[PDB]
Ligand binder design. Structure first.
Ligand SMILES: Cc1ncc2sc(C(=O)N3CCC[C@H]3c3ccc(Cl)cc3)nn12
Lengths: 267, 343
């Protein structure tokens, strides 16, 4: 789907959903009463992985999965984890993202079956009970999601600019698979809420070049871009890999999930 | 869901029935849903609004894509989404627009019923091309362009400005195959083209332009699965002539080409041409208007002009120049929309 491809600078993404880092951290403090900063990041990583598994099981293209991931992040950038259960929100984000695209639809029974099967087969370390929600909960949650994103549905990702950069380098076979995988990894951080996607793409490509010992200094010099911001993004990517190393998702998440604030019922 | 979160959002939610007076003010009902002429209940402004309750419940592909695209698109000749209201109780979606009193269907009928300043037709075409070009430059196809969907603003600050509406937002796999008229459908659609294209929109603009010039649909035929429609093709050939091999080399690649060859003979249409058709409806074939029309109504979609090139045509540099107000400051003779009282 190439809709709005050259419109980023007049887009809802750019104009409303490139957030201030200090505003984001300010809104986050409500949930940091229950969780440490490290625990909150681990929770973000976990639900990114959940959304990825849901999308893979549904056979969705990576761009749809990425859109679902940014819907999830946008929701919890603004609201508390207790507002709506993230176990319900994740499949809802996948459902809505799938409908913004045009090549195929995710049916109701297929979404619920995917949520149930994926959580059982790939996430039983986190979740002792089966997926408890039915399709009416997804549909209700979808209305809240759409409203609370201010109906902003078109999301730009680093994949398209990355492809253009790697083509321009003439290094598709060398650098693209690794750089693409590093783009996937950036969704385990806040970067998509903070930087234009092309900047994230350049940072991922830089790390790919360093890993593979490819000298691209002159090519990165030929770009008219704020390299200080690219370096900021690289530092977050390098930090993610150190956290990844020190994080055992499977051993820690049940404990972290129990510490999450939970939706208060009616009186 | 957190209860405090729920009651807070319920307290704060703007509801269409509380914000707008639209009871008994329905101006249209169709596949799109229900369209009302609305006014704000608090007197903050005195403007007229259009309120559309989308057909069905929940968020359909049509609704999802309509909201997704209109949330981003910003151009004077594309209808602007002002607000979205989500009604949780009945799962209904409401879209708010600035109200367009007129559209090309009703303008054309008004002229047809009579049997227009100098540059009205030209001004309409230019603005249609401007709006479609903006969509196309953003890789958005309209896919259902017709006189009924080309709105024109009435009295107010946007007097006589074209607003392209009803963009046909959801077509599975971008495919035309997945009371109907085929008068604005490009011949490649009729021969089984698997995907919508920019060229398909351009053909429809050509049809609309011919209709604005004559007040008659150029490829008129009877109304009413299979994309192949025999009588519609017959009508196109009776107007345009039958394409030579050299006119449309890739016609052989169309899935219904062999059906076309079975049903039609070239010789049937030997004295038929757009020149002769337009001569009968008092359009001069040596006019710049005609030469542009002929470029829009090219049978081979790869030989059809783009919206950009159409906007650059010297037709638009010839007196009279197109105007922002297509009525050119003259008094609007067209009647206002009537309200629907049918059950
Ligand atoms: C009158 C009007 N002003 C602004 C707007 S958007 C809007 C719409 O959704 N649509 C969908 C089909 C074509 C258009 C329309 C046009 C006329 C009428 Cl009677 C009803 C609907 N209609 N409309």
């Amino acid at each position: 789907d190439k809709a709005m491809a050259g419109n980023f600078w007049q887009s809802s993404h750019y104009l409303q959903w490139i957030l201030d880092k200090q505003d984001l951290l300010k809104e986050r403090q409500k949930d940091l009463k229950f969780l440490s900063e490290e625990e909150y990041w681990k929770l973000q990583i976990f639900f990114t992985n959940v959304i990825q598994a849901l999308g893979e099981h549904l056979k969705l293209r990576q761009q749809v999965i990425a859109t679902a991931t940014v819907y999830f992040k946008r929701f919890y950038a603004r609201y508390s984890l207790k507002s709506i259960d993230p176990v319900l929100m994740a499949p809802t984000c996948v459902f809505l993202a799938s409908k913004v695209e045009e090549f195929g639809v995710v049916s109701n029974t297929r979404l619920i079956a995917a949520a149930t099967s994926v959580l059982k087969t790939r996430f039983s370390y986190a979740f002792p009970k089966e997926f408890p929600y039915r399709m009416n909960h997804i549909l209700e949650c979808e209305f809240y999601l759409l409203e609370l994103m201010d109906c902003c549905l078109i999301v730009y990702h680093p994949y398209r600019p990355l492809l253009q950069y790697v083509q321009d380098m003439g290094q598709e076979d060398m650098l693209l698979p690794l750089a693409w995988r590093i783009v996937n990894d950036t969704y385990r951080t806040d970067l998509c809420l903070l930087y234009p996607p092309f900047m994230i793409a350049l940072a991922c490509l830089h790390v790919a070049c360093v890993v593979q010992q490819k000298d691209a200094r002159q090519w990165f010099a030929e770009l008219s871009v704020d390299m200080e911001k690219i370096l900021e993004i690289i530092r977050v990517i390098l930090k993610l890999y150190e956290q990844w190393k020190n994080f055992d998702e499977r051993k820690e998440m049940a404990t972290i999930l129990s510490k999450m604030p939970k939706p208060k019922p009616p009186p | 869901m957190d209860y405090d979160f729920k009651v807070k959002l319920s307290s704060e939610r703007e509801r269409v029935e509380d914000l707008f007076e639209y009871e008994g003010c329905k101006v249209g009902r169709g596949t799109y849903g229900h369209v009302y002429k609305a006014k704000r209940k608090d007197g903050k402004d005195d403007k007229d609004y259009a309120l559309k309750q989308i057909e069905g419940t929940g968020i359909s592909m049509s609704a999802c894509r309509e909201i997704a695209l209109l949330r981003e698109l910003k151009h004077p000749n594309v209808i602007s989404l002002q607000k979205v209201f989500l009604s949780h109780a009945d799962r209904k979606v409401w879209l708010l627009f600035d109200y367009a009193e007129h559209d090309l269907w009703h303008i054309i009928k008004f002229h047809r019923a009579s049997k227009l300043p100098r540059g009205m037709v030209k001004s309409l075409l230019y603005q249609i091309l401007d709006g479609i070009h903006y969509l196309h430059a953003n890789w958005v196809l309209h896919r259902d362009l017709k006189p009924a969907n080309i709105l024109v603003m009435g009295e107010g600050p946007e007097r006589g400005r074209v607003k392209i509406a009803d963009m046909g937002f959801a077509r599975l796999f971008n495919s035309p195959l997945k009371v109907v008229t085929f008068w604005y459908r490009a011949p490649e659609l009729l021969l089984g083209a698997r995907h919508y294209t920019k060229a398909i929109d351009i053909w429809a603009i050509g049809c609309i332009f011919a209709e604005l010039l004559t007040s008659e649909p150029i490829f008129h035929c009877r109304q009413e699965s299979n994309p192949y429609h025999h009588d519609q093709l017959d009508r196109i050939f009776n107007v345009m002539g039958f394409p030579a091999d050299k006119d449309w080399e890739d016609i052989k690649k169309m899935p219904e080409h062999s059906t076309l060859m079975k049903d039609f003979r070239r010789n049937t249409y030997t004295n038929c041409s757009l020149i002769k058709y337009m001569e009968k409806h008092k359009v001069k074939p040596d006019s710049k208007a005609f030469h542009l029309l002929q470029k829009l109504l090219t049978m081979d979609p790869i030989k059809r002009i783009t919206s950009e090139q159409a906007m650059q045509d010297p037709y638009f540099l010839e007196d009279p120049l197109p105007t922002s107000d297509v009525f050119a400051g003259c008094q609007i003779p067209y009647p206002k929309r009537e309200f629907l009282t049918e059950e």
